[PDB]
Amino acid sequence: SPGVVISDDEPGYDLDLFAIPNHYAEDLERVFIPHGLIMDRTERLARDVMKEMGGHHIVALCVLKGGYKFFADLLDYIKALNRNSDRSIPMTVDFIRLLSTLTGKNVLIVEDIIDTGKTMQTLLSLVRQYNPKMVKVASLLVKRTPRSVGYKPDFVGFEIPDKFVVGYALDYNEYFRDLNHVAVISETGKAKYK
Amino acid sequence: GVVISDDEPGYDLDLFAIPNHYAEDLERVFIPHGLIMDRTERLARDVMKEMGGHHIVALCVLKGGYKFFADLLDYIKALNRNSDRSIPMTVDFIRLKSYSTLTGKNVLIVEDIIDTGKTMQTLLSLVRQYNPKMVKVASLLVKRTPRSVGYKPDFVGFEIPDKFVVGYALDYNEYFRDLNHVAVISETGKAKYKA
C-alpha cells in the first residue's frame, strides 16, 4: 500500500468550508488534507501496524516535533484495537529529534513527512546499531520527488506531490503546528513567517 | 457546500478501516467519515450564527438523517459550552410518507439528502402553517440532478454527482446504513439488493 494517492492536480478545499483559526485566516490558501481524513487513514494504518508487529512487544519511537500528533493519534487507534480485542501486545514509548532499550524489540518509527529520505535512513542506520527484532517506519506523508534517494516507509498515510504543506504539527518555521488540518500556505503567510 | 465534481474518482475501500466484502457491492468511498465531521463542525458554526438568536427546535428526519443529526448537534453543543453566545435547543424526530411545538420557534430541519427537492418543499409547507419565527434546512448532501425542482437548503454539507450513495445512515432499500462512510453503490449492487 502506497497510501492514499493525492493527485498532482488536487486543488484542495476552500478555507470557508471548514473551521480554521483566525490568526491563520490569511496565511493559508487551501485545506489540502482535512483533519478527519487523516484520522480515517490513521485508523486503517493502526490495523496494518497491528497485523505486522502485534506479535511482539512494540516500542513506538516518536520523531519530534512534526510527528507528535500523528504519533499520539496512531497510538490511540492502536490502544483502541487492543482493549477491544483478545489479541494485544504491550507498548512502551520513546522520543527523538534530528537508547539500548530497542534491542530485541519491534521498533515502530513514527514520522510526519518523508521527502529526500535522508532523515529516515539516518534514523534507521542509527537504530539498527542497537539490534532490534524489526524496524518499521510509519510516515504520514511521502512526497513524489526526484530529490528522493529511493527510500519508502513501511506504512504510509498519504502520498503527495512535491508541494510544501503545513498543519497537523508540521511546521513553517515553527508556525502552523497549532493546526488540525494539513494545508498549503498563501503568499502572505510565507512572507509573514519567513 | 463542498462541491464534489462529476469526475471525482473517490477513494479505494482498502485505504480505510472498511470490511473488504463491500467490494463487489458499492464502488468507491466518496465522502470519508472524517471529512463529514470537519464539514459538519463548520456547519454547526454557521447554524449557530444564523439561528443562535432564538430557541432552536432541531427536527431530525428519520431514518436517513439520524447520524448527521446526532453529529451536527454534538458540534453545536460543543460550541454552546465553550463560548459566550449560546441558545437552548429542543429535539424532535419525524418520518415522511410513501407512494405545533414549532410555533414562534426557530426550526432547524435536519435531512440526509436532497434529490429532486420536493420532499423538503412539502415538509416546508406543512411547517410555516403553524407560524414559526424561522425555518431553515440543513442537509448533509445535495445532488446535482436534472430532476431537481430548484429548491436549495440553507445549510449544505456536500454537493454530490447524480449517483446513488449509501452509508452514514443513508440507505439503498434499507441496506448499508451501518456503513460509516458515504459511498457509491454499483449497478450490480443495486440489482443485488433491489426489492
Place this chain on the structure above:
Amino acid sequence: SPGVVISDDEPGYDLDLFAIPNHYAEDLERVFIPHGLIMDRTERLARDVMKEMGGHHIVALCVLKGGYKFFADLLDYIKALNRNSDRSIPMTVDFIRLDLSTLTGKNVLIVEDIIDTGKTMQTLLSLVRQYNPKMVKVASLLVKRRSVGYKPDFVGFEIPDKFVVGYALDYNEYFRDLNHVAVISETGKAKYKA
C-alpha cells in the same frame, strides 16, 4: 452486571470544574455523570452486547427521544467492534416512541435512556415479543434504585432515586442538549416547570 453503581451519598462534581452551556449555568446544580464516563462505560457495554448478541443478525431498537444519543454512541462502538472482528454481521437500526415486522427471528436490542418503575420497558417488551424474535435484550443507560421487579440485560449506571437530566434525558423536553448527566437546581426546576 448491575452496571456502574452510583451510591446516594455521591455529591457529584462542581459545575465550575466542567464545561457547561451558559443557558443552563444556574439551571443546574451538580454534574452527576460526566459525558466521557458515559462513553467509557458505553464502550464496555458494546463488547458485552456483542459477546451475547453478536452471534446473529442484530436489530437495534432506539427508544425516542431520551435514548437517541445513548443509541448513537452505543451503536458506533458496536459497529466498530463489528468491523474489527473480521466477521461483520448484519446490523440494522429502527426507532420507536412511547410496523416493526422486521424484528422476526433476529436478535433485537432495545436501547433505552432510563428505567424507573419498569412500566415503560414492560409495555415495550410485550409489543416486541409479539413478533417472535430470536432473543430480546434491553440496554438501559440508567437504572434507578423495589418496583415491580425488572432487570435490564445490560446496565450502564445504577443511580439513586433522584431526577437527573442531560445526555438526551430531559426535564419538560429541556436539558436534552446537554452532554453530561447532571442534577437540576431549584431555580431550574421552577423555570421549566409545566
Place this chain on the structure above:
Amino acid sequence: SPGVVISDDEPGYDLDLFAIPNHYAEDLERVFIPHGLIMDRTERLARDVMKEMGGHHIVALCVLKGGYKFFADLLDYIKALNRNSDRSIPMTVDFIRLDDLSTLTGKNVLIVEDIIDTGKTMQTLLSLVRQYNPKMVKVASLLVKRTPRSVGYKPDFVGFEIPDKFVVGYALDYNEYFRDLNHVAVISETGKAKYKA
C-alpha cells in the same frame, strides 16, 4: 481551585466495568480516573488556560514523557477553541526532558506536566524559565498529590487532586509500562512485581 478533588476514601472502579487492554488484565487492580473523565476536565482546563493566557503568543511546553497525553489532548481542545471564535492566538510548541529557551522571552509560556508530588520538579523548572523573562509562565498539571512530602507548590491549572497513592495510565508510567493505557489506574501487586526494575 484544587481541581476535581478525589477523596482518599475512593474505592475506584472495577476493571470489568470498563475496557482495559488484556495484557494488563492482572497488572491492574482498580480504574482510578476513567479516560473520558480526564477529557471532560481537560476541555474545561483548555478554556481556563485560554481565558488567562490567550492575550499573547503562547508557547506550550510538554514535559516528556508522561506529559505527552495530557499535552496532546489539552492542545486539541485549545485548537477547537481557537477555530470556533473571532479572536484567537498563535501557538508554538516544544518538548523537554527533565529549543534555545530565549524563545520563551516575552511569551506566554504554558508548562504541561503529568503529575506533581513533592513539587520540586516544577519549582526548579519554574525558577529557570522565569530567568528568560517570559511575558508570563503558568503550569498545567493533570494530577496533584496530597502528600506530606510536598514542598508547598501548587500549579496554576490542575486536573485532579489525587491521594498519596501510585497511579499509572494516560502516559503516566511504572518502569516505562502502562503508558499504553487510556485510564488512570492503580497497579496491582502482581503487576508491581511483573515489571519491577
